[PDB]
């Protein structure tokens, strides 16, 4: 189907430790495949998915250098940001960056992304035409003027239309085994009595990838929009995901309740009931 590559940078300034902590993680869809942490003993890009290990020493050395320069640049961006908001140096502040590209089933660029947050609020973002920015702020308007004079957008476009898509296609092919895969949820319902006349039915989805999933409970085919307890989808720690939904039902009438699981790996939604 459709696919995405994304990198997430976080930079956190520290008051007396002169350099910010800089962390980067790289993803294809919901699979983490690289990481970099400036606080490591010897900071360098490290593999985090099997299919990226075959990349050569020039891949790791070049990316390590990119992160090292990005950490220093972030350090200076953080100062500039503190200056723009008249904040004192003694404060700890956060700069996050998120960028990458989306491709369709044929591998053509669908969309490029490149945006920033400062202390958790949108700061500046590259627009969909990859030729202009939306500034969220008076401070971000300073960044915009500078990036307009530098023709920054044209540099982001060079990457997003070029090497971004090109390496994503290469990864999708190298990890085809696990990336074109959609693993459908293996599902079951459990029964937990509350009292003599109440019981909880819990609908479980386990071992599925990617994370997107919808669980919906129905009594007699009617959606239980309210009355359904839903946990946030959560990582199992093995690159698959977990989720459950629950309803409290009257004892005796449990077969009237049905759980529907919809997922990308399910051509037909699963319908589940106890037992």
């Amino acid at each position: 189907g459709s696919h995405s590559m994304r990198y997430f940078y976080t930079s956190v300034s520290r008051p007396g430790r002169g350099e910010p902590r800089f962390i980067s993680v790289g993803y294809v869809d919901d699979t983490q495949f690289v990481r970099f942490d400036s606080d490591a003993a010897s900071p360098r890009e490290e593999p985090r998915a099997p299919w990226i290990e075959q990349e050569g020493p020039e891949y790791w050395d070049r990316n390590t250098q990119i992160y090292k320069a990005q950490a220093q640049t972030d350090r200076e961006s953080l100062r500039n940001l503190r200056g723009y908001y008249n904040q004192s140096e003694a404060g700890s502040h956060t700069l996050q960056s998120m960028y990458g590209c989306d491709v369709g089933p044929d591998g053509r660029l669908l969309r490029g992304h490149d945006q920033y947050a400062y202390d958790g609020k949108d700061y500046i973002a590259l627009n969909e035409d990859l030729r202009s920015w939306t500034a969220a702020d008076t401070a971000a308007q300073i960044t915009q003027r500078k990036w307009e004079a530098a023709r920054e957008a044209e540099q982001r476009r060079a990457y997003l239309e070029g090497e971004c898509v090109e390496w994503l296609r290469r990864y999708l092919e190298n990890g085809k085994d696990k990336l074109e895969r959609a693993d459908p949820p293996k599902t079951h319902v459990t029964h937990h009595p509350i009292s003599d006349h109440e019981a909880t039915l819990r609908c479980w989805a386990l071992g599925f990838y990617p994370a997107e999933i919808t669980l919906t409970w129905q009594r007699d085919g009617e959606d239980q929009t309210q009355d359904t307890e839903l946990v946030e989808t959560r990582p199992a720690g093995d690159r698959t995901f977990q989720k459950w939904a629950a309803v409290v039902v009257p004892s005796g009438e449990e077969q009237r309740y049905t759980c529907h699981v919809q997922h990308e790996g399910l051509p037909k939604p699963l319908t589940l009931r106890w037992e």
Partner: peptide, 11 residues
């Protein structure tokens, strides 16, 4: 592959 092009671009 990270974007090396912008690794010098300050905000």
């Amino acid at each position: 592959h990270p974007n090396g092009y912008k690794s010098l671009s300050t905000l």
